[PDB]
Amino acid sequence: VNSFSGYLKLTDNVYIKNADIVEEAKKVKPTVVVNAANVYLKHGGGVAGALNKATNNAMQVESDDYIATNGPLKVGGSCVLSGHNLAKHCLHVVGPNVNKGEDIQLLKSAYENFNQHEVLLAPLLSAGIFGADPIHSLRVCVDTVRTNVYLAVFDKNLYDKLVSSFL
Numbered sequence: 775v776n777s778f779s780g781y782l783k784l785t786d787n788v789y790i791k792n793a794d795i796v797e798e799a800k801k802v803k804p805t806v807v808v809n810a811a812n813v814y815l816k817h818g819g820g821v822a823g824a825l826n827k828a829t830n831n832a833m834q835v836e837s838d839d840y841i842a843t844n845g846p847l848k849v850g851g852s853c854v855l856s857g858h859n860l861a862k863h864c865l866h867v868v869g870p871n872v873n874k875g876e877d878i879q880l881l882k883s884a885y886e887n888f889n890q891h892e893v894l895l896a897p898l899l900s901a902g903i904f905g906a907d908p909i910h911s912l913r914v915c916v917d918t919v920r921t922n923v924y925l926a927v928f929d930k931n932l933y934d935k936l937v938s939s940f941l
């Protein structure tokens with residue numbers, strides 16, 4: 775038993791809710807919140823901009839030190855940093871950005887990072903301003919992640935479409 779509330783169960787291990795991931799993280803304080811990161815950990819907009827704003831820019835400060843030490847992530851890769859006031863840990867995961875021409879096959883590699891964590895709160899990777907089809911992202915999630923994932927979908931219209939079209 776965990777504290778996630780109001781989710782629709784899609785499969786044995788995947789759950790979904792129409793929710794603001796920032797508000798959900800602040801209420802649940804999960805062990806892991808996933809950020810929709812880019813390789814530079816520049817958290818300007820989308821989910822990343824919202825999560826970073828909620829940390830009063832502490833996420834960005836920590837991220838800039840990470841990059842200065844380690845260099846950029848790979849598309850499809852991840853790193854574990856602090857969750858600040860939102861979670862114990864933040865798993866920064868880089869999905870391919872279609873608006874940069876990145877290979878959508880890398881979306882499966884991106885979701886594989888979730889399997890290193892028993893339970894996660896997450897957005898749909900490569901959705902929103904990353905330009906991929908969220909229905910496809912949900913399909914890859916379900917077919918790749920084996921650990922327990924709680925997906926927060928900000929847009930109610932999109933949430934209803936994801937549920938109603940789910941196979």
Ligand SMILES: O=C(O)[C@]1(F)CN(c2ncnc3[nH]c4cc(Br)ccc4c23)CC12CCC2
Pocket residue numbers: 793794795796810819820821822824897898899900901902903904926927928
């Ligand atoms: O960035 C995009 O375009 C997204 F559509 C939006 N994301 C979110 N997901 C879940 N809760 C979210 N709360 C927010 C608050 C603000 Br302000 C901005 C974005 C979000 C957000 C998912 C997405 C990132 C990968 C696809």
